[model samples]
Target: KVFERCELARTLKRLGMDGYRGISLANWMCLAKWESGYNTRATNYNAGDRSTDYGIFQINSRYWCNDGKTPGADNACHLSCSALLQDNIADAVACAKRVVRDPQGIRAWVAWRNRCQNRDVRQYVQGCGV
Candidate 1:
């Protein structure tokens, strides 16, 4: 599922992402925009560590979800990597919440830091009525 911008903004609000751990829905929107462009089935492989990033938020198998193949995987999200690719984003949202609970908070995603951090992120949610 490739969500329209406002569609994802509203959906994330319903999932309680509006201000989870002080991260706003706009920030989440920006993260998803760069991470997967709101696509549910996006995937990226990291040859350096042989781990894979999955789904809209690109949660990694190395430390977040389990793919049963990542070396030294932590599975902190306690979810299968496949779950992150589903059209239903409930599991991916849950894992994304968990990721922010870490010390890095939303900065856990490098894309957020490089592309979203310190930027005027409100545009990501503009006209969404969120």
Candidate 2:
């Protein structure tokens, strides 16, 4: 369940995250590209912690959602990882909004740190016209 770039932008805009908290839509688009390539079913099993990340935003099992593998995850979102892996990402967007509110802000995403942080990501959404 992957989304096309333009379609994803429109969807995200409707999810209350298009330009959330000064984070431009371009940056969000870039983040999605690096995190999961707009794949709603994407999962990343992090061997380092024996936990997993799920969905378009790669919400972590360690502290956000329960992947049912980690013994005792914080599950701050009080949600299951399965909730994120869907064609409709309403829950994922809700959870993602909560995640960025942490003190670190969007830096909570490693993909942002690695590629989008302090970098010009405007090109990511070039011609999307959304």
Candidate 3:
């Protein structure tokens, strides 16, 4: 089920972010696995009282789809369920790639993994691999 959402590889190829300048499928998978357990519908337990958060990307409803019409109307426009429907894999991958592009951002991600690595929760690091 989790493996099905990994479109980062394909998306990377499409966006020309694969091979050397792009991220490896394996690394992308690792990040997705840790972030939301591959659950597009996943959300933070601390999301307050919002119900619009949806899909594998877990994008907050307020950020993208906030229209201020209905209960979840804010996310009705900007937020697309397709983003998590596996059909929009490129969107998810792009989101991840954008994060990776930032040195500080990706470094923070590495630091988070380091915490798990120290506790024996992770068997591999980003650059060194397993």
Using TM-score as the measure, the top candidate is 1
Which residue pairs clash within candidate 1?
A: none
Q: Which pairs clash (backbone N, Cα, C closer than 3 Å) in model 2?
A: none
Error of 3 at 126 (Å): 16
Please identify which of the two predictions, 1 or 3, would achieve the higher lDDT against the true structure: 1
1-130 per-residue lDDT for model 1 (tens digits): 9999999999999999999999999999999999999999999999999999999999999999999999988899999899999998999999999999999999999999999999999899999999
**TM-score per candidate:** 0.98, 0.93, 0.46
In order, what lDDT does every prediction score? 0.96, 0.86, 0.46
Report the Cα lDDT for candidate 3: 0.46
Best by lDDT: 1
**Candidate 2 Cα outliers beyond 4 Å, as residue runs:** none
* Each model's total of backbone clashes: 0, 0, 7
lDDT of 1 at 114: 100
What would you estimate as the lDDT of candidate 1?
0.96
Model 2 TM-score, 2 decimals: 0.93
Off by over 4 Å in 3: 1-22, 45-87, 108-130
The alpha-carbon deviation from the true structure for residue 124 of candidate 3, after best TM-score superposition, in angstroms, is 9.7
Better of 2 and 3 by TM-score: 2
